[PDB]
Amino acid sequence: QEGLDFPEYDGVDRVINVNAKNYKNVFKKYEVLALLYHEPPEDDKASQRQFETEELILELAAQVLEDKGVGFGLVDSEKDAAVAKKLGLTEVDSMYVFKGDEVIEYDGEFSADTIVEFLLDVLEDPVELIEGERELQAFENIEDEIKLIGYFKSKDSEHYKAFEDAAEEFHPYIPFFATFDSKVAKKLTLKLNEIDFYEAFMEEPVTIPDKPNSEEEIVNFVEEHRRSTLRKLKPESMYETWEDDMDGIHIVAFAEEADPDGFEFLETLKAVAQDNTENPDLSIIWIDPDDFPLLVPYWEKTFDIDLSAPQIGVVNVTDADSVWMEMDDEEDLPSAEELEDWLEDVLEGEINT
Amino acid sequence: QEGLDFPEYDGVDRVINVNAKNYKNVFKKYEVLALLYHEPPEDDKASQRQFETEELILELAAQVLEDKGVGFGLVDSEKDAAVAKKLGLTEVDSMYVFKGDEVIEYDGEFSADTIVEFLLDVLEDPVELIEGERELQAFENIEDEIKLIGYFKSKDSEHYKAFEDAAEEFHPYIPFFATFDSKVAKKLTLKLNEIDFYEAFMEEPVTIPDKPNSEEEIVNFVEEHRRSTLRKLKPESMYETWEDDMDGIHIVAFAEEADPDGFEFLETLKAVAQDNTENPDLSIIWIDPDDFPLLVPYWEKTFDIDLSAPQIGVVNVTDADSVWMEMDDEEDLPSAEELEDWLEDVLEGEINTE
Ligand SMILES: [Ca+2]
Ligand SMILES: [Ca+2]
Ligand SMILES: [Ca+2]
Ligand SMILES: [Ca+2]
Ligand SMILES: [Ca+2]
Ligand SMILES: [Ca+2]
Ligand SMILES: [Ca+2]
Ligand SMILES: [Ca+2]
Ligand SMILES: [Ca+2]
Ligand SMILES: [Ca+2]
Ligand SMILES: [Ca+2]
Ligand SMILES: [Ca+2]
Ligand SMILES: [Ca+2]
Ligand SMILES: [Ca+2]
Ligand SMILES: [Ca+2]
Ligand SMILES: [Ca+2]
Ligand SMILES: [Ca+2]
Ligand SMILES: [Ca+2]
Ligand SMILES: [Ca+2]
Ligand SMILES: [Ca+2]
Ligand SMILES: [Ca+2]
Ligand SMILES: [Ca+2]
Ligand SMILES: [Ca+2]
Ligand SMILES: [Ca+2]
Ligand SMILES: [Ca+2]
Ligand SMILES: [Ca+2]
Ligand SMILES: [Ca+2]
């Protein structure tokens, strides 16, 4: 047991209501402060089981992260509407994390381990250096998220400081990389002060134009390319992604990456997303069921599919109505051309929910 | 919300005490039955509640898996000592999962999502087929666990049936793969009815000798090669692995695989593992801190290390005393030869916790 003991809540009240009186003092009490902006719970007792148990989730995270200077608080959308408005808490059930001069919206799975992992990521520095062949291979292994890398001459470079300033705008959701090593820059085809932007799952980057780049030019570029043609659903941002629907629907692909059949389907999906990456109307959410075991039976029931096999369909975010590509079984996968044809009919509305 | 709605516990009592009077019926009710074998909780209310929250974890899992034929129950080590002995429940705080003729011990993180993911793995078939080049790439992509692959003529082969019987013995912890595809077999260098065993993180397999292989020969081989030179700690088996030290210590390497610094260290670690894989006294636990976020502050405090940098150290399993390889910072990583020398000093006893 010694060397491996999960923490058990100790009953100490660490998460309290944050109101117009105490909010100035709460902030001075923590290096990083995360505020859950919530609606007052319903008068019925069944909604209290959901509210108390989720405050206890924040209490566990508060306990785990105490010695790292993190604190958690609750902000009532009615009782505290005034202070909420001044702090910038506008989305009910989001958790706003305050680090330095940035406000980070958490809109992901409400679970202690996922919240703690997210705060640990927030506490890290917003730029990761790349030096040498091994660290470069590490950068190149990243595919399931947007990434940026820039080539500068040193930490003191004025353009590096603008890169770091832009990095803080998207922390911790978009990893920003910098290299001062010319051999790395050579392999990446980076001229000095050039910044390459890699859309998730794309092998070919786009250089931000008009080098060198100020913070404003980077922030503007990223905001314009924020939605990848193929996105992976991730627990830490699952509701942010799900709320970003394409005119009422999502195209959802289920594939277990480690399974031979899921891998085979996933390769086809990546290849089709790469070949159609310039289509502005095309977005696909890849869900690996192994990332969301507690939702697998729900999904199988709601969608009437077998998640032991790869699937792709259209999901309506209003009522969870759905239509799925017909496959005989896990061996009956579509070719890249059959997948494109199905995606084309979906986008033309010929395959509707 | 809609299409992305996590289940919340509904209050229905699905997990009950399983005892001499009802166990035969509980077993008959469920296709797959998971039994938590636990001591009676202490008389105070603090441990009485920690026991209730663990039962609520099983209640959520039971609710989520109800339609898949899975049930959960609780067996008291004192009140139900007799039925525990009858069923083979011996390790307090383990959960025993009954599928067909097998009894599968769960000794991993006690949380609803890890337990549900585990049971979903239990429900899967014990042998995965490989056909075609892309499924072969998927097989070759597996590295962080032991794996076996055999080449057979079809499922009607006696040797396939022996292989699937052996697979059931280790399900779901060691993935067994079968191919009937002679082109895949040629690419793997498998003769018909041969079985190759891949130790975790090793490029080159070991062929099980004395082809063709009975169930007993496969099981015996796997048991003798159960302990990889480099083993990744996983939530589903974390306590099983931690309780499996050889001599009183674990060599523990912390490395975040996705981080450039962790990756650089990890590649060195794998190289040293592969070069020293025949040393029977060498075994290293690789912990990726991102798999265990709720333990990261505790590890940092207990071990006096910074887990945003890679680390390797010796941990005594009796008193948690530890000693860590000294590194100036995350760039001061050892070479393969310096790691070897450090590991050699550990196994010689020069570097020790005492
Ligand atoms: Ca509280
Ligand atoms: Ca939201
Ligand atoms: Ca989890
Ligand atoms: Ca992390
Ligand atoms: Ca700055
Ligand atoms: Ca991140
Ligand atoms: Ca270029
Ligand atoms: Ca410019
Ligand atoms: Ca949001
Ligand atoms: Ca499969
Ligand atoms: Ca298959
Ligand atoms: Ca695109
Ligand atoms: Ca998982
Ligand atoms: Ca296939
Ligand atoms: Ca119960
Ligand atoms: Ca145990
Ligand atoms: Ca699984
Ligand atoms: Ca059999
Ligand atoms: Ca498994
Ligand atoms: Ca061979
Ligand atoms: Ca034989
Ligand atoms: Ca055990
Ligand atoms: Ca790093
Ligand atoms: Ca580095
Ligand atoms: Ca070995
Ligand atoms: Ca993680
Ligand atoms: Ca380095």
Asked if residues B65 and A297 have their Cβ atoms less than 8 Å apart, the reply is: yes
Radius of gyration, CA atoms only, chain B: 22
Q: What is the resolution of this structure in A?
A: 2.0
Sign of CA dihedral A338, A342, A343, A345: positive
Give long-range contacts, CB 8 A cutoff, 24+ apart: A97-100.
A97/A32, A97/A33, A97/A34, A97/A35, A97/A122, A98/A27, A98/A32, A98/A33, A98/A34, A98/A35, A99/A32, A99/A123, A99/A171, A100/A168
Closest Cα in chain A, distance from residue B319 (Å): 6
Residue reference for tokens 């779901």: B172
CB-CB neighbours of A248 under 10 Å: 11
Bridge partners of residue B74, in order along the sequence: B17, B36
Q: What is the DSSP letter of A42?
A: P
d(CA B85, CA B88) in angstroms, rounded, equals 5
d(CA B165, CA A141) in angstroms, rounded, equals 38
Q: Which residue type, as a one-letter code, is found at position B324?
A: W
Angle at B29 between CA B53 and CA B75, to 5 degrees: 40
Asked if residues A192 and A151 have their Cβ atoms less than 8 Å apart, the reply is: yes
Phi-psi map region of A11: left, alpha, beta (phi>0 left; psi -120 to 50 alpha): left
Nearest by CB to B4, from A4, A134, A242: name it.
A242
Nearest by CB to B294, from A64, A139, A142: name it.
A64
Q: Identify the residue among B294, B298, B324 best suited for mutation to test binding to A, counting A beta carbons within 10 A and taking the highest.
A: B294
d(CA A302, CA B176) in angstroms, rounded, equals 32
Distance of CA A168 to the CA centre of its chain: 15
d(CA B224, CA B230) in angstroms, rounded, equals 16
Phi-psi map region of A189: left, alpha, beta (phi>0 left; psi -120 to 50 alpha): left
CB contact under 8 A, B2 and A142: no
Cα-Cα-Cα-Cα torsion B20, B21, B22, B25, nearest 10 degrees, comes to 100
d(CA A197, CA A225) in angstroms, rounded, equals 9
Nearest by CB to B117, from A68, A252, A290: name it.
A290
Q: Is A12 on the interface with B (CB under 8 A)?
A: no
How far, in Å, is the centroid of ligand 26 from the Cα of A113? Answer: 8
Q: How many residues does chain A have?
A: 353
d(CA B87, CA B105) in angstroms, rounded, equals 12
Asked if residues A100 and A110 have their Cβ atoms less than 8 Å apart, the reply is: no
Asked if residues B184 and B237 have their Cβ atoms less than 8 Å apart, the reply is: no
- The phi and psi torsions of B32 (rounded to 5 degrees) equal -130, 130
Angle at A117 between CA A113 and CA A119, to 5 degrees: 120
- The phi and psi torsions of B249 (rounded to 5 degrees) equal -135, 160
- The phi and psi torsions of A287 (rounded to 5 degrees) equal -110, 120
> Nearest bound ligand to CA A164?
5
Sign of CA dihedral A266, A267, A270, A276: negative
Enumerate residues 6+ apart whose C-beta is below 8 A from B54. Answer: B36, B110
DSSP code string of A278-339: T-TT--EEEE-GGG-GGGHHHHHHHHT--TTS-EEEEEETTT--EEE---SSTT-PPPHHHH
Q: Between residues 252 and 271 of chain B, which touch chain A (CB distance below 8 Å)?
A: 252, 258-261, 263-264, 267
Domains of chain A: 1-126 (3.40.30.10), 127-228 (3.40.30.10), 229-353 (3.40.30.10)
Phi-psi map region of B85: left, alpha, beta (phi>0 left; psi -120 to 50 alpha): alpha
**Residues preceding discontinuities in chain B at C–N > 2.5 Å?**
none
Residue A79 token pair: 């009782």
Enumerate residues 6+ apart whose C-beta is below 8 A from A349. Answer: none
Residue reference for tokens 């003092």: A25
Q: Using alpha carbons, select from A231, A268, A203 the residue that is nearest to residue A144.
A: A231
Closest Cα in chain B, distance from residue A117 (Å): 5
- The phi and psi torsions of B157 (rounded to 5 degrees) equal -60, 135
Three-state DSSP class for B78? coil
Residue B345 token pair: 């000093």
- The phi and psi torsions of B307 (rounded to 5 degrees) equal -85, 5
Three-state DSSP class for A211? coil
State how beta strands B195-198 and B147-151 pair.
Answer: antiparallel
d(CA B310, CA B257) in angstroms, rounded, equals 10
Asked if residues A73 and A36 have their Cβ atoms less than 8 Å apart, the reply is: yes
d(CA B230, CA B276) in angstroms, rounded, equals 10
d(CA A99, CA A30) in angstroms, rounded, equals 10
Strand order through the sheet with A176-179: A127-129, A176-179, A147-151, A195-198, A206-207
Experimental method, per PDB record: X-ray
Q: What is the DSSP letter of B335?
A: P
Cis peptide upstream of residue A310 (ω within 30 degrees of 0): no
Residue reference for tokens 């976020």: B293
